[PDB]
């Protein structure tokens, strides 16, 4: 209903967010792999600010971030730790007019009681 | 009309559910039946049970989907000995917040039908 | 306009049905193969009934079926003989709410004066 | 506006028709012309003539499509020495019942143009 | 706004026209090729006339053509020289009812001050 | 709201613009950053400057896109040492006439960010 990313000491209004995890399955349909993925894909409005891009281009240190989902009270909160921005796009279209879509790849993601942690 | 998933001691309203099975053919059926993955689409709440069930434990589980019309129980898809093998959650201010996940199970059953994998 | 499948001693209202046949063509565009395909793809409403699925999962014997197409009088009739259900999907979507799509692979299909018969 | 296929001693109303031809190019045209398959889309009736013509016999045939406007004959695509190499019939209560089929022919002709395959 | 193809001593009203050119780029994103493409794709109404097709099927000699773009005065003009029709489709659909789409591959294309010329 | 490209000593109204960058990952980021191509979509006029800049010369160039809201300058994407590596112009009586082209540049800059290729 409302989603607020805390990132790089700033807040951004989230238009849309998705994260996904997967395990392989063999022929007999038995799970045949550990869990992989956990990339977070975020979509936020553009302003004069270039902090997200700077965070990808201008430095090399891992970061943390926080998305808080609300209704109308904090419903739940997706956080990541030790991540890097691995995909960035900014788009203007004079017809949501100006926006950024970027993906974080992080060693740890957490939300409510769940934790996913990569093999690094 | 209405579908109710019973999973992990909780109930979830099903926005959409699909399960499928297939056999190969040659140039004549040429294989045993495979697939039987169940794909479920449910609303998100404060709950993280589905994901916890994927990430936080390793033990197979059972689940139950009950399909209804107007008011009784029309039929019921159950699985046994399954694992969540695909999860995605999406938020979009434009159904606002939802989970789509896939169960891979050794046994699925509905009405009089039973499908059971070679394990 | 109205299509009625007779299958497994029951009748089902057909939402949609398609069957297809094909022959290869070489470079010069000459037909370069016998006719293959003839799979029938059927789409019917779900009820409490699980006969179609049972017919795929619970037994192994070939079957016959019959689709009668009407207008408003029997217009024509697609029949198959010695077939097997090789693909099944059932879908519920609380937005046609609940339906089955399945494919029959059969040694013989017939409609009006046409007959197609596989090499088995 | 209106298209009428004459085939197998019968007439069929054409919902849609396309034919195409092409030549390859290199990094300059680099091939003779190929294709010339005709793709036809017509209403289904009690008739099974088109399918019978594919399944039940083996002899090449001719056909004729006449394109009209308002009332005469605008132009006419004809084929000679062809075979039906693809057939699909579809019923859908939502054009309700139709056939889509492809003719592969040695010769197609329309207005002053002629295309003829290397056979 | 209005586009008029002059071709084979006739004029045709252009429903739509597109041409495109491209150069490869390496990993470092440096251009890594000369310019290629320059095929023109044209879309015109069908009449009783079969001149375009005849030009593809019935002869083998290169040709020239001219598209004039207007507003409401000639805005600019795409011309080609030494070209061949390498793709033709005609479509009727009783739902633009009857039309031709064809592609010209030409050694030289020119528009305003630009010229592109293939290696033949 | 409004975007103005300054290129080849002229200005063009931007219908749409996108630029993107990415890094590969392994089974963890596993590459330096690549991409940074800018994709621009502008109206056609009597002008052929963009195409001339691709076809008629061979020297790298710079350009400037200024993004605005309501009235000042919100931010500005600039490139340096670039080449037009993809051009398409389309006319369609149904935006009627437009150009879509891609710039590949050694350096792009916007607000405080800078991206620079390994050349």
């Amino acid at each position: 209903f409302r989603a607020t990313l805390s990132f790089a000491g700033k807040e951004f209004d989230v238009l849309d967010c998705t994260y996904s995890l997967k395990r392989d399955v063999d022929s007999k349909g038995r799970p045949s792999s550990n869990i992989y993925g956990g990339q977070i894909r975020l979509h936020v409005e553009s302003t004069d600010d270039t902090s997200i891009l700077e965070n990808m281009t201008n430095q090399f240190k891992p970061h943390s971030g926080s998305i808080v989902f609300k209704k109308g009270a904090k419903m739940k909160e997706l956080t990541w730790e030790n991540g890097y921005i691995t995909e960035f796009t900014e788009n203007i279209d004079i017809v949501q007019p100006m926006t950024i879509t970027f993906v974080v790849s992080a060693q740890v993601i957490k939300i409510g009681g769940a934790q996913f942690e990569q093999n690094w």
Side-chain angles (χ1 to χ4, degrees), chain A residues 1-24 26-27 29 31-70 72-120:
Chain A
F1 267 81
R2 205 34 129 244
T4 298
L5 167 73
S6 290
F7 183 55
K10 273 136 263 190
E11 302 193 335
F12 304 87
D13 179 64
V14 159
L15 302 168
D16 59 70
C17 175
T18 183
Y19 67 96
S20 108
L21 296 157
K22 178 165 168 71
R23 294 175 63 175
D24 303 326
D26 58 43
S27 303
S32 57
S33 113
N34 251 223
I35 307 170
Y36 61 94
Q39 283 195 310
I40 305 163
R41 174 184 149 116
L42 282 164
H43 181 211
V44 302
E45 274 156 289
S46 297
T47 70
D48 48 322
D49 160 333
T50 57
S51 303
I52 299 159
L53 187 60
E54 282 149 23
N55 206 267
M56 188 187 194
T57 54
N58 290 20
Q59 52 97 54
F60 221 173
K61 272 159 295 182
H63 43 250
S64 284
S66 178
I67 303 92
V68 185
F69 307 96
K70 191 153 154 285
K74 170 178 312 101
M75 176 192 224
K76 67 186 172 176
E77 179 185 334
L78 169 65
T79 66
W80 78 79
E81 289 168 38
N82 212 244
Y84 298 93
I85 288 170
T86 60
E87 187 183 309
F88 177 107
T89 293
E90 182 152 30
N91 166 269
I92 157 124
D93 175 0
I94 323 218
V95 155
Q96 40 235 355
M98 193 161 183
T99 73
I100 287 166
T101 302
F102 71 104
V103 170
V104 171
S105 185
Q107 201 182 261
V108 170
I109 65 175
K110 299 192 185 160
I111 178 163
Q115 280 202 25
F116 172 74
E117 195 194 294
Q118 299 267 18
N119 215 352
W120 305 354

